[PDB]
Enzyme design. Structure first.
Site, short mmCIF file in Angstrom:
data_model
loop_
_atom_site.label_atom_id
_atom_site.label_comp_id
_atom_site.label_asym_id
_atom_site.label_seq_id
_atom_site.Cartn_x
_atom_site.Cartn_y
_atom_site.Cartn_z
N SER A 113 0.83 -1.20 0.00
CA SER A 113 0.00 0.00 0.00
C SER A 113 0.86 1.26 0.00
O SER A 113 1.65 1.47 -0.92
CB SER A 113 -0.96 -0.01 1.20
OG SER A 113 -1.99 0.95 1.03
N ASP A 165 -9.63 -4.90 -5.35
CA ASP A 165 -9.09 -4.07 -4.28
C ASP A 165 -10.01 -2.89 -4.02
O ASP A 165 -10.14 -2.02 -4.89
CB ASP A 165 -7.69 -3.60 -4.66
CG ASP A 165 -6.91 -3.05 -3.47
OD1 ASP A 165 -7.36 -2.05 -2.87
OD2 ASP A 165 -5.86 -3.62 -3.13
N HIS A 199 -7.99 -5.80 -1.00
CA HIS A 199 -6.82 -5.13 -0.45
C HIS A 199 -6.12 -6.06 0.54
O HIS A 199 -6.18 -5.84 1.76
CB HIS A 199 -7.20 -3.82 0.23
CG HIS A 199 -6.03 -2.95 0.55
ND1 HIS A 199 -5.22 -2.39 -0.42
CD2 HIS A 199 -5.51 -2.55 1.74
CE1 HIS A 199 -4.27 -1.67 0.15
NE2 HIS A 199 -4.42 -1.76 1.46
#
Length: 220
Positions: A113, A165, A199
């Site tokens: 991320s 995601d 995610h």
């Protein structure tokens, strides 16, 4: 100069190194425990802890973040000063690793991320011949004004993204992948999307990272 991290040391004498930056929120213990599994006995895994700063993305409340975040879209404003500052902070650690006997082409920069974003920006601006990048579900900070740079960009990029995601858009990752292949050699950039995952990571993605690191950091 002042590094705090959950470092995973190798079984044999460390000849290669990996600097992995966790996602926005948690510390380095999670990714240290994760990278202890996929583990080559000659590679050390450094997972620093992000400083607790205010994040404009959420009421400007205080949480661990590598820099100031304002959005997860390609049109969102970015903390240019904070990104460059954190990139210099990572370059200092890379140079320390090189100064104590670990060459640049044996150093892999990775993250998840926001950590993967900072890792991507650092390795694409680092003047030292870094080995490769491992970017999982992230983006390239300041991708527009980027000469499609750094120095000696023979880098190998393993970018992985969740097809579903809900945090970082998958098209942001695709744009980042297409912008990375512009700089370095496109044959050296793998961009793996994983269907069904969001995610998050998965054993297939971890195995891709294992193969990438095993053929990029061999027992030399």
């Amino acid at each position: 100069l002042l590094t705090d991290a959950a470092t995973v040391s190798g079984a044999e004498r460390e000849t290669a190194a990996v600097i992995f930056l966790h996602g926005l929120g948690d510390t380095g213990h999670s990714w240290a425990d994760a990278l202890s599994t996929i583990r080559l006995p000659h590679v050390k895994y450094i997972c620093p802890h992000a400083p607790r700063i205010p994040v404009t993305l959420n009421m400007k409340m205080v949480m661990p973040s590598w820099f100031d975040l304002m959005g997860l879209s390609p049109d969102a404003p970015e903390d240019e000063a904070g990104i460059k500052k954190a990139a210099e902070n990572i370059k200092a650690l890379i140079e320390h690793e090189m100064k104590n006997g670990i060459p640049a082409n044996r150093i892999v920069l990775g993250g998840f991320s926001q950590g993967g974003a900072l890792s991507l920006y650092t390795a694409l601006t680092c003047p030292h011949p870094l080995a490769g990048i491992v970017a999982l579900s992230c983006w390239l900070p300041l991708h527009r004004a980027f000469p499609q740079n750094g120095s000696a960009k023979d880098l190998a990029i393993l970018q992985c993204h969740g097809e579903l995601d809900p945090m970082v858009p998958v098209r942001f990752g695709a744009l980042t992948a297409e912008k990375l292949r512009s700089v370095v050699t496109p044959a050296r950039v793998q961009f793996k999307t994983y269907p069904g995952v969001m995610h998050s990571s998965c054993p297939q993605e971890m195995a891709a990272v294992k193969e990438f690191l095993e053929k990029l950091l061999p027992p030399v």
